[PDB]
Amino acid sequence: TDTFQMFWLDYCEVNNTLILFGKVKLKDDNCVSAMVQINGLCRELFFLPREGKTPTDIHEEIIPLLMDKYGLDNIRAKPQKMKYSFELPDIPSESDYLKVLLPYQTPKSSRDTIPSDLSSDTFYHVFGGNSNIFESFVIQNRIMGPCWLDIKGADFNSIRNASHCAVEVSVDKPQNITPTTTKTMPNLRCLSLSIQTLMNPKENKQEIVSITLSAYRNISLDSPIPENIKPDDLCTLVRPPQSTSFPLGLAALAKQKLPGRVRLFNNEKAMLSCFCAMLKVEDPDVIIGHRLQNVYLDVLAHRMHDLNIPTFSSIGRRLRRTWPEKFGNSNMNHFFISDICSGRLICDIANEMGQSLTPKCQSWDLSEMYQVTCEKEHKPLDIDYQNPQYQNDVNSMTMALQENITNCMISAEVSYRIQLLTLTKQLTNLAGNAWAQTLGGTRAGRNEYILLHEFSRNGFIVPDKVFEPEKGLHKNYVLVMDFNSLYPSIIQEFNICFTTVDRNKEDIDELPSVPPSEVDQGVLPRLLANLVDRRREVKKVMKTETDPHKRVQCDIRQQALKLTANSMYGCLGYVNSRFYAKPLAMLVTNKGREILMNTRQLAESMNLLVVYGDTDSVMIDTGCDNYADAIKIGLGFKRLVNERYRLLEIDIDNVFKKLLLHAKKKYAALTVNTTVLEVKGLDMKRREFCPLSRDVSIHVLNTILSDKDPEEALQEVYDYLEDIRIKVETNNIRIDKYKINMKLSKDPKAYPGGKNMPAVQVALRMRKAGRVVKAGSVITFVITKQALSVAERAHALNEVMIKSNNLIPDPQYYLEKQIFAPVERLLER
């Protein structure tokens, strides 16, 4: 009742301070944005005494020397016993250190860090020199991801015009900030962004043509988000792709045909200026999109830079009048943009995190994700604003904007359906890192912080920053068994930890041995055990829970706990990990091979056949032709594996009634859920083949994988093909089915070997005729019969459809290159 309370979401570093962005509740129960500037943070350094020396000896040497370099009056320092258990060979298991608190903000040389290998006759190592300020705050104050923060001694008059937030305060010391236990959170303001660009061939520059903004101002993660939730506001901005003016009637047609507002601008600079202004006023907590992180945010940033947009900083929540000096270095561009966006969470459904939640996808194209996650179909329009029709054709312009609007709302809907926010929040609360790092990073970040918190809290010093596939058709049900928990069960079962495994820190290639049963449970195994235990606690509560809201919540919690545990191996296995330890990785890997090798023998002891296997999954031929019998075999195998390995709990992930297998991610099959056809890795190049070819291939699979005898079905195939061969020769198939699309990456006159490419020959024939066609143009053609080359015989579809042109499809080409070659692979085995 006397403290400033904020729910923190994101952060940024500046002038050796730490700024937290979050939300504050007002007297009308509404929540607005807020920022907190944190001063007084210090790096925690630990100086390691020399043989015979003490911490007091160290205090006498460096403290006075540190006061000089940094120009400090006094420096807090004191002896402290700390444990060490990582890869530096010359440091003991436990020692008395001198803990020195060195402020980030210092009068002198504040940007100069103390090296770990600092020369001295009292100590021979220094930990914590290069500490990151966010890390220091989070670890010292035990902050575990986004949560409510009690902030005492908040100064409401110190900060002036620093942010795009409604409330700005500061604090003199980080100890004034403590986390609360409150489990609920405020509603989030989400803004879905969809951007349409244009490639300027002159400068090879990506330019922005339009932007759609869909606002959802009350997304509550405390309850499930309702499907097909409608936006509170929808607006589209657009500039002319070619000239300074749009086609006539555009505004009247927009109001008539397009949902939400449409705003027209005379140029891109004006458009982007309005965009920034809208962002500021909307003040969203989350920006949702598809491929924002490493495609469109880059384009957006550079264009605001190119066009010198003064209000560019409103993409984030800190106010800057000028860009960073070095903005313009390849890799550094990522940091600058991420830094500028600080304050607003980037919810990208198609980045690494987004993909990890949607393993059933293959391309992660927007329309594909929409199909997989929402079971809805959207046929994507290929909009090319280079085409001249968009400068005078009002209907084309309108359809293109509709495509943008649709994509914007699809991106949002998908992000909610795959529960990208709640899952990432839970993952962040479990690992103790930043929500932004979880949304936009790899697993390593979570892996890193979960250990940083775990070890630091128990007085530890942390480090400074397969079975080849059986190719063919499998007639018996094949089950895919999930072995994701393999490594975390090994680490737990054999008590493998940085603190338990005696290892030679000189030669990291030397294989160590697991600790004897006498050794107490280590930090890493205990962490895993706790995660597994809590997961069970949740699943127990679920069985009883009646309320669908709380139940759905439990399922999210349960998932997060699982993902956290199954990512732990990365901590010690990933080469570039802060906690990388080769002796441990090898130790866990070898035990993993044994278990898998023995898992094979176990399968065979039940008269099962291992079709494929690796550390993540094992595929088993059940030998049954019935779902029930297959599942029972599957569970029997599950029980058998657990009896031999008490901590290894595998499960059935995929059920294949039939399986045409080539590799782990290259197969066709009838999956059960209601049987359904599923193809992976064999649907790469659909574009190069016509509808007839794709209709043939699909029909062939269906019949082959059908529950019909393998001769009658295979005869049904020949009766089908032969019939297709006669229909092609007599040309009694729709001309549509022969069509082949091909996009031009470069201008037709500059295509090397154009004489061989049918699309180019047809494109050039349009030029010499008169019609215009450039790079990016999609050529639809059909190979015709009359020696003339295949490319020469290629003609535009619309031409071939006109009977009076006397053009017919060439049987030779379509029977050999379009029907034979593809099938020659389908029926190889």
mmCIF file of N, CA and C in Angstrom, residues 507-579:
data_model
loop_
_atom_site.group_PDB
_atom_site.id
_atom_site.type_symbol
_atom_site.label_atom_id
_atom_site.label_comp_id
_atom_site.label_asym_id
_atom_site.label_seq_id
_atom_site.Cartn_x
_atom_site.Cartn_y
_atom_site.Cartn_z
ATOM 1 N N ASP A 507 42.664 -32.868 -19.659
ATOM 2 C CA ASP A 507 42.283 -33.540 -20.895
ATOM 3 C C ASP A 507 40.778 -33.788 -20.914
ATOM 4 N N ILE A 508 40.056 -32.954 -21.654
ATOM 5 C CA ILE A 508 38.600 -33.032 -21.698
ATOM 6 C C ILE A 508 38.109 -34.208 -22.539
ATOM 7 N N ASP A 509 39.014 -34.826 -23.291
ATOM 8 C CA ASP A 509 38.653 -35.958 -24.138
ATOM 9 C C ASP A 509 38.679 -37.268 -23.355
ATOM 10 N N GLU A 510 39.175 -37.213 -22.124
ATOM 11 C CA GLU A 510 39.257 -38.399 -21.280
ATOM 12 C C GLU A 510 37.891 -38.742 -20.699
ATOM 13 N N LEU A 511 37.481 -39.995 -20.865
ATOM 14 C CA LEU A 511 36.193 -40.453 -20.362
ATOM 15 C C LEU A 511 36.268 -40.730 -18.864
ATOM 16 N N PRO A 512 35.383 -40.095 -18.080
ATOM 17 C CA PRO A 512 35.327 -40.343 -16.639
ATOM 18 C C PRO A 512 34.344 -41.456 -16.293
ATOM 19 N N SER A 513 34.157 -41.706 -15.002
ATOM 20 C CA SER A 513 33.234 -42.735 -14.545
ATOM 21 C C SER A 513 32.146 -42.113 -13.681
ATOM 22 N N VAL A 514 30.962 -42.716 -13.694
ATOM 23 C CA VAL A 514 29.869 -42.240 -12.858
ATOM 24 C C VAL A 514 30.289 -42.348 -11.399
ATOM 25 N N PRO A 515 29.733 -41.484 -10.540
ATOM 26 C CA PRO A 515 30.081 -41.534 -9.118
ATOM 27 C C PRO A 515 29.512 -42.773 -8.440
ATOM 28 N N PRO A 516 30.180 -43.255 -7.383
ATOM 29 C CA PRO A 516 29.657 -44.394 -6.623
ATOM 30 C C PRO A 516 28.387 -44.017 -5.870
ATOM 31 N N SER A 517 27.507 -44.988 -5.655
ATOM 32 C CA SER A 517 26.219 -44.738 -5.014
ATOM 33 C C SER A 517 26.348 -43.938 -3.717
ATOM 34 N N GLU A 518 27.534 -43.956 -3.116
ATOM 35 C CA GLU A 518 27.758 -43.282 -1.839
ATOM 36 C C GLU A 518 27.675 -41.758 -1.961
ATOM 37 N N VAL A 519 28.089 -41.227 -3.106
ATOM 38 C CA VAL A 519 28.090 -39.782 -3.322
ATOM 39 C C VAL A 519 26.668 -39.217 -3.319
ATOM 40 N N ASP A 520 26.483 -38.096 -2.627
ATOM 41 C CA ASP A 520 25.175 -37.455 -2.520
ATOM 42 C C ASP A 520 24.695 -36.916 -3.863
ATOM 43 N N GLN A 521 23.379 -36.810 -4.013
ATOM 44 C CA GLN A 521 22.783 -36.309 -5.246
ATOM 45 C C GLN A 521 23.279 -34.897 -5.549
ATOM 46 N N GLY A 522 23.723 -34.684 -6.783
ATOM 47 C CA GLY A 522 24.258 -33.399 -7.196
ATOM 48 C C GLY A 522 23.189 -32.364 -7.495
ATOM 49 N N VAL A 523 23.629 -31.187 -7.933
ATOM 50 C CA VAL A 523 22.726 -30.074 -8.211
ATOM 51 C C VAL A 523 21.866 -30.335 -9.450
ATOM 52 N N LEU A 524 22.500 -30.776 -10.529
ATOM 53 C CA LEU A 524 21.802 -30.988 -11.791
ATOM 54 C C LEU A 524 20.762 -32.112 -11.681
ATOM 55 N N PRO A 525 21.156 -33.270 -11.123
ATOM 56 C CA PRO A 525 20.188 -34.359 -10.945
ATOM 57 C C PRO A 525 19.032 -33.966 -10.028
ATOM 58 N N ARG A 526 19.336 -33.235 -8.961
ATOM 59 C CA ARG A 526 18.314 -32.801 -8.018
ATOM 60 C C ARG A 526 17.357 -31.834 -8.697
ATOM 61 N N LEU A 527 17.896 -30.997 -9.576
ATOM 62 C CA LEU A 527 17.079 -30.058 -10.325
ATOM 63 C C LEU A 527 16.109 -30.831 -11.209
ATOM 64 N N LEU A 528 16.632 -31.817 -11.931
ATOM 65 C CA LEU A 528 15.809 -32.641 -12.811
ATOM 66 C C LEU A 528 14.753 -33.406 -12.026
ATOM 67 N N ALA A 529 15.152 -33.976 -10.893
ATOM 68 C CA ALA A 529 14.225 -34.728 -10.060
ATOM 69 C C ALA A 529 13.059 -33.839 -9.635
ATOM 70 N N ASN A 530 13.366 -32.606 -9.245
ATOM 71 C CA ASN A 530 12.333 -31.664 -8.823
ATOM 72 C C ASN A 530 11.371 -31.331 -9.958
ATOM 73 N N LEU A 531 11.913 -31.181 -11.163
ATOM 74 C CA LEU A 531 11.100 -30.874 -12.335
ATOM 75 C C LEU A 531 10.170 -32.038 -12.660
ATOM 76 N N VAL A 532 10.704 -33.253 -12.604
ATOM 77 C CA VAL A 532 9.904 -34.444 -12.858
ATOM 78 C C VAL A 532 8.831 -34.602 -11.785
ATOM 79 N N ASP A 533 9.203 -34.371 -10.531
ATOM 80 C CA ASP A 533 8.257 -34.499 -9.431
ATOM 81 C C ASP A 533 7.107 -33.517 -9.581
ATOM 82 N N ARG A 534 7.439 -32.262 -9.848
ATOM 83 C CA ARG A 534 6.424 -31.231 -9.982
ATOM 84 C C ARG A 534 5.501 -31.532 -11.157
ATOM 85 N N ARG A 535 6.049 -32.112 -12.218
ATOM 86 C CA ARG A 535 5.236 -32.473 -13.367
ATOM 87 C C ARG A 535 4.192 -33.513 -12.968
ATOM 88 N N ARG A 536 4.591 -34.479 -12.147
ATOM 89 C CA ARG A 536 3.654 -35.492 -11.672
ATOM 90 C C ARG A 536 2.587 -34.840 -10.804
ATOM 91 N N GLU A 537 3.018 -33.967 -9.899
ATOM 92 C CA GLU A 537 2.091 -33.227 -9.054
ATOM 93 C C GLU A 537 1.006 -32.575 -9.908
ATOM 94 N N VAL A 538 1.411 -31.989 -11.032
ATOM 95 C CA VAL A 538 0.471 -31.323 -11.929
ATOM 96 C C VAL A 538 -0.486 -32.321 -12.576
ATOM 97 N N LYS A 539 0.055 -33.420 -13.093
ATOM 98 C CA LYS A 539 -0.768 -34.436 -13.743
ATOM 99 C C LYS A 539 -1.742 -35.094 -12.767
ATOM 100 N N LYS A 540 -1.358 -35.176 -11.498
ATOM 101 C CA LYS A 540 -2.257 -35.695 -10.473
ATOM 102 C C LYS A 540 -3.437 -34.747 -10.308
ATOM 103 N N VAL A 541 -3.136 -33.455 -10.222
ATOM 104 C CA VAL A 541 -4.163 -32.433 -10.061
ATOM 105 C C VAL A 541 -5.102 -32.389 -11.267
ATOM 106 N N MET A 542 -4.575 -32.697 -12.448
ATOM 107 C CA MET A 542 -5.373 -32.664 -13.670
ATOM 108 C C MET A 542 -6.468 -33.725 -13.651
ATOM 109 N N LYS A 543 -6.095 -34.951 -13.300
ATOM 110 C CA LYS A 543 -7.041 -36.061 -13.266
ATOM 111 C C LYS A 543 -8.300 -35.699 -12.483
ATOM 112 N N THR A 544 -8.142 -34.854 -11.468
ATOM 113 C CA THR A 544 -9.255 -34.474 -10.603
ATOM 114 C C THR A 544 -9.940 -33.193 -11.073
ATOM 115 N N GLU A 545 -9.155 -32.258 -11.598
ATOM 116 C CA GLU A 545 -9.668 -30.944 -11.974
ATOM 117 C C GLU A 545 -10.861 -31.042 -12.921
ATOM 118 N N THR A 546 -11.905 -30.274 -12.620
ATOM 119 C CA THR A 546 -13.120 -30.267 -13.428
ATOM 120 C C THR A 546 -13.179 -29.033 -14.326
ATOM 121 N N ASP A 547 -12.829 -27.880 -13.766
ATOM 122 C CA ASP A 547 -12.856 -26.622 -14.507
ATOM 123 C C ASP A 547 -11.921 -26.673 -15.715
ATOM 124 N N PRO A 548 -12.477 -26.493 -16.924
ATOM 125 C CA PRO A 548 -11.664 -26.525 -18.147
ATOM 126 C C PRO A 548 -10.570 -25.458 -18.166
ATOM 127 N N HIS A 549 -10.826 -24.308 -17.551
ATOM 128 C CA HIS A 549 -9.836 -23.237 -17.510
ATOM 129 C C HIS A 549 -8.597 -23.674 -16.740
ATOM 130 N N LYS A 550 -8.792 -24.063 -15.484
ATOM 131 C CA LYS A 550 -7.692 -24.517 -14.643
ATOM 132 C C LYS A 550 -7.012 -25.739 -15.248
ATOM 133 N N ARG A 551 -7.797 -26.593 -15.898
ATOM 134 C CA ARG A 551 -7.264 -27.814 -16.492
ATOM 135 C C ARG A 551 -6.335 -27.488 -17.658
ATOM 136 N N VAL A 552 -6.788 -26.614 -18.549
ATOM 137 C CA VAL A 552 -5.964 -26.169 -19.667
ATOM 138 C C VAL A 552 -4.681 -25.535 -19.142
ATOM 139 N N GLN A 553 -4.808 -24.771 -18.063
ATOM 140 C CA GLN A 553 -3.659 -24.141 -17.429
ATOM 141 C C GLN A 553 -2.664 -25.204 -16.967
ATOM 142 N N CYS A 554 -3.173 -26.246 -16.317
ATOM 143 C CA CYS A 554 -2.332 -27.343 -15.846
ATOM 144 C C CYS A 554 -1.568 -27.987 -16.998
ATOM 145 N N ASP A 555 -2.240 -28.164 -18.130
ATOM 146 C CA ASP A 555 -1.621 -28.803 -19.286
ATOM 147 C C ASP A 555 -0.468 -27.961 -19.831
ATOM 148 N N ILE A 556 -0.627 -26.641 -19.796
ATOM 149 C CA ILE A 556 0.443 -25.734 -20.199
ATOM 150 C C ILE A 556 1.620 -25.861 -19.241
ATOM 151 N N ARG A 557 1.323 -25.797 -17.948
ATOM 152 C CA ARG A 557 2.338 -25.946 -16.914
ATOM 153 C C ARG A 557 3.108 -27.251 -17.094
ATOM 154 N N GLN A 558 2.359 -28.329 -17.294
ATOM 155 C CA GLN A 558 2.924 -29.660 -17.449
ATOM 156 C C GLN A 558 3.856 -29.731 -18.660
ATOM 157 N N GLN A 559 3.428 -29.134 -19.769
ATOM 158 C CA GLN A 559 4.240 -29.086 -20.981
ATOM 159 C C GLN A 559 5.550 -28.353 -20.730
ATOM 160 N N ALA A 560 5.451 -27.173 -20.125
ATOM 161 C CA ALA A 560 6.625 -26.350 -19.850
ATOM 162 C C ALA A 560 7.643 -27.113 -19.007
ATOM 163 N N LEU A 561 7.169 -27.794 -17.971
ATOM 164 C CA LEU A 561 8.054 -28.579 -17.117
ATOM 165 C C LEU A 561 8.779 -29.647 -17.932
ATOM 166 N N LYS A 562 8.049 -30.299 -18.831
ATOM 167 C CA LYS A 562 8.624 -31.332 -19.681
ATOM 168 C C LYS A 562 9.720 -30.757 -20.575
ATOM 169 N N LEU A 563 9.400 -29.679 -21.287
ATOM 170 C CA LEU A 563 10.345 -29.051 -22.204
ATOM 171 C C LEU A 563 11.605 -28.607 -21.473
ATOM 172 N N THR A 564 11.436 -28.122 -20.248
ATOM 173 C CA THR A 564 12.564 -27.643 -19.458
ATOM 174 C C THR A 564 13.513 -28.793 -19.141
ATOM 175 N N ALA A 565 12.952 -29.903 -18.670
ATOM 176 C CA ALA A 565 13.750 -31.075 -18.326
ATOM 177 C C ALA A 565 14.456 -31.642 -19.556
ATOM 178 N N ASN A 566 13.719 -31.769 -20.654
ATOM 179 C CA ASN A 566 14.256 -32.377 -21.870
ATOM 180 C C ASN A 566 15.233 -31.476 -22.621
ATOM 181 N N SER A 567 15.447 -30.271 -22.109
ATOM 182 C CA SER A 567 16.409 -29.353 -22.706
ATOM 183 C C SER A 567 17.699 -29.291 -21.888
ATOM 184 N N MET A 568 17.668 -29.863 -20.686
ATOM 185 C CA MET A 568 18.780 -29.755 -19.743
ATOM 186 C C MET A 568 20.101 -30.292 -20.288
ATOM 187 N N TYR A 569 20.043 -31.321 -21.126
ATOM 188 C CA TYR A 569 21.268 -31.906 -21.660
ATOM 189 C C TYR A 569 22.092 -30.866 -22.414
ATOM 190 N N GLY A 570 21.409 -29.946 -23.089
ATOM 191 C CA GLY A 570 22.077 -28.888 -23.826
ATOM 192 C C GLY A 570 23.054 -28.113 -22.963
ATOM 193 N N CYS A 571 22.758 -28.030 -21.670
ATOM 194 C CA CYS A 571 23.611 -27.317 -20.724
ATOM 195 C C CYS A 571 25.059 -27.789 -20.796
ATOM 196 N N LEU A 572 25.256 -29.103 -20.837
ATOM 197 C CA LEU A 572 26.599 -29.668 -20.764
ATOM 198 C C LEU A 572 27.052 -30.293 -22.082
ATOM 199 N N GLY A 573 26.139 -30.386 -23.045
ATOM 200 C CA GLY A 573 26.427 -31.045 -24.307
ATOM 201 C C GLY A 573 26.729 -30.095 -25.451
ATOM 202 N N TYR A 574 26.074 -28.939 -25.456
ATOM 203 C CA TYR A 574 26.273 -27.960 -26.519
ATOM 204 C C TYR A 574 27.667 -27.343 -26.426
ATOM 205 N N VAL A 575 28.416 -27.439 -27.521
ATOM 206 C CA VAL A 575 29.818 -27.027 -27.555
ATOM 207 C C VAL A 575 30.037 -25.598 -27.064
ATOM 208 N N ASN A 576 29.148 -24.693 -27.456
ATOM 209 C CA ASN A 576 29.301 -23.285 -27.119
ATOM 210 C C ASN A 576 28.480 -22.892 -25.894
ATOM 211 N N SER A 577 28.203 -23.867 -25.037
ATOM 212 C CA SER A 577 27.440 -23.620 -23.822
ATOM 213 C C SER A 577 28.332 -23.083 -22.713
ATOM 214 N N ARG A 578 27.766 -22.201 -21.899
ATOM 215 C CA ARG A 578 28.477 -21.628 -20.768
ATOM 216 C C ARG A 578 28.834 -22.710 -19.757
ATOM 217 N N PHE A 579 28.073 -23.801 -19.768
ATOM 218 C CA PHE A 579 28.295 -24.899 -18.837
ATOM 219 C C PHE A 579 28.779 -26.151 -19.557
#
